[PDB]
Design a protein around this nucleic acid. Sequence first.
RNA 1: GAGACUUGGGCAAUGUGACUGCUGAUCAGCAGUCACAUUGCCCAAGU
Length: 49
Amino acid sequence: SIAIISLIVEFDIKRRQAETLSVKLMHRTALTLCEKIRHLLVQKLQDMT
RNA sequence: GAGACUUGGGCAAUGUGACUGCUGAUCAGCAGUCACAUUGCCCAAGU
């Protein structure tokens, strides 16, 4: 969970500094899937929590 | 001697007025110097 949180900011900064529209979109998809992975992880953590 | 009057040498201040000089800080413009950040490229290694 902590590593995926770090990946959130890494993808955020790479998307912010990216220029090509294709690269922008690819970074956005990577960040979205990073959020989904985080959500599955934390939802599994919290139902047990 | 008593004195009045004037220029002096001044001693004082109560005013009041104006002049001159300097320091410091702030801002703006310009010039230059320190470090730091970002996107790259390439190389050196070790397993």
